[PDB]
Ligand binder design. Sequence first.
Ligand SMILES: COc1ccc2c(c1)c(CC(=O)O)c(C)n2C(=O)c1ccc(Cl)cc1
Ligand SMILES: CS(=O)(=O)Nc1ccc([N+](=O)[O-])cc1Oc1ccccc1
Length: 121
Amino acid sequence: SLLEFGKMILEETGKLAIPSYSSYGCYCGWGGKGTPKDATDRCCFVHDCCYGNLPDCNPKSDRYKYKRVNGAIVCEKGTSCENRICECDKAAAICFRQNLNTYSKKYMLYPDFLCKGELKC
Ligand SMILES: COc1ccc2c(c1)c(CC(=O)O)c(C)n2C(=O)c1ccc(Cl)cc1
Ligand SMILES: CS(=O)(=O)Nc1ccc([N+](=O)[O-])cc1Oc1ccccc1
């Protein structure tokens, strides 16, 4: 569920998923199309890409459980949809953490028309 992801995001970056990440660039939050504007945007692209490999799971509403082993995010055994979802979120969390230094606010609330071009996952 978005609950676990959002929390994972906040612990990791200290920023709130909504709104620091729900509308960022071309891929954070909406998905659809375009060329990721930047590293964080790529994190969302590869994320939207991750959920794409689980066609029969429900990322937004299926709740999984994780723990921190000293700072590490550790997904706990759950259904397999739950496990594979959790891994996809950990990546994003990490990825965001790895590029906070270039998170730019000129991408917050980015208008859709500026998002065009192709990208295949
Ligand atoms: C390309 O990226 C995707 C693909 C599928 C997705 C999502 C994002 C999100 C999250 C979102 O992008 O809001 C949800 C909840 N998806 C599904 O549950 C889903 C369920 C049935 C089918 Cl047939 C296809 C997808
Ligand atoms: C997945 S969505 O429909 O594209 N919108 C949405 C996007 C991201 C997040 N979130 O917490 O990262 C939360 C989101 O939706 C919420 C809005 C209000 C309260 C809880 C979740």
